[PDB]
Design a protein around this ligand. Structure first.
Ligand SMILES: Nc1ncnc2c1ncn2[C@@H]1O[C@H](COP(=O)(O)O)[C@@H](O)[C@H]1O
Ligand SMILES: [Mg+2]
Ligand SMILES: [Mg+2]
Length: 252
């Protein structure tokens, strides 16, 4: 009784519960199927996590649109004021590899403003820790998390002027949460990505009072017709001017 203000969860509570629940299911799938066929393992994780998440979002938020990596996109979301942007399993490659803990579940709520208002990132292999927008708290040399698979070429240019050690990690969620944790100073990506890769990490990053933008400094924009969103910078606030500047100076 008495809900929240303005099966009875706030949007942030639901984001966190969805992320944890999908996390537990993924851990079950990993234990059941095992690692002999990494392709089969990854496919099962993607498909089963997606199924759980879509079932629960229909049951618990039947009026909300959903954009998932693992489902067709009917574009009804473009007319909605409330859109869940989900990556049922981010870092499928890493999930499918024995002993790797750098994979995530991304659950973001986009709300139309006159933008990512609530979000959670689960790292199921790290004790199923769930970072959430409603509980997350607020220069000589830089540690920068980059893709273990497709690191951005632009890094090479900025390293001519800034002392940087790249830290190879799988998953956008894992790299963003390494920034929150203080394991790295920044997460930098370019060369391609999708909205569900960055929406929940961005929500958490901004809620923690940290920086999250495009490489050119402009805001990350979601619920776009084309959900391709190819580059990002997520970092401590104090680090953003240094990196955005170096990126800008790499141009000219
Ligand atoms: N160049 C790229 N184009 C499209 N998607 C990417 C690219 N690099 C990374 N991703 C996606 O971003 C997420 C994290 O990737 P990674 O940081 O490489 O583990 C995964 O969903 C990848 O498929
Ligand atoms: Mg995925
Ligand atoms: Mg992904």
């Amino acid at each position: 009784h008495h809900h929240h203000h303005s099966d009875d969860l706030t949007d942030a509570e639901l984001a966190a519960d969805l992320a944890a629940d999908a996390g537990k299911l993924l851990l079950q799938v990993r234990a059941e199927i095992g690692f002999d066929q990494p392709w089969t393992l990854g496919e099962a994780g993607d498909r089963q996590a997606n199924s759980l998440l879509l079932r629960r979002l229909q049951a618990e938020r039947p009026g909300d649109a959903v954009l998932s990596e693992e489902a067709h996109d009917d574009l009804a979301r473009l007319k909605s004021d409330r859109v869940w942007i989900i990556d049922p399993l981010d870092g499928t490659r890493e999930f499918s590899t024995p002993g790797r803990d750098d994979w995530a579940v991304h659950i973001a709520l986009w709300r139309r403003s006159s933008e990512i208002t609530d979000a959670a990132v689960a790292l199921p292999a790290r004790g199923n820790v769930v970072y959430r927008t409603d509980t997350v708290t607020s220069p000589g040399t830089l540690r920068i998390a980059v893709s273990a698979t497709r690191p951005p070429a632009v890094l090479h240019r900025i390293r001519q002027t800034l002392a940087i050690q790249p830290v190879s990690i799988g998953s956008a969620g894992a790299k963003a949460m390494a920034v929150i944790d203080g394991y790295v100073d920044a997460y930098l990506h370019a060369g391609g990505q999708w909205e569900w890769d960055s929406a929940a990490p961005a929500g958490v990053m901004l809620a923690a009072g940290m920086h999250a933008s495009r490489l050119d400094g402009s805001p990350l924009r979601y619920n776009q017709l084309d959900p391709y969103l190819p580059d990002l910078l997520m970092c401590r606030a104090e680090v953003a001017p240094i990196l955005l500047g170096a990126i800008a100076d790499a141009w000219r």
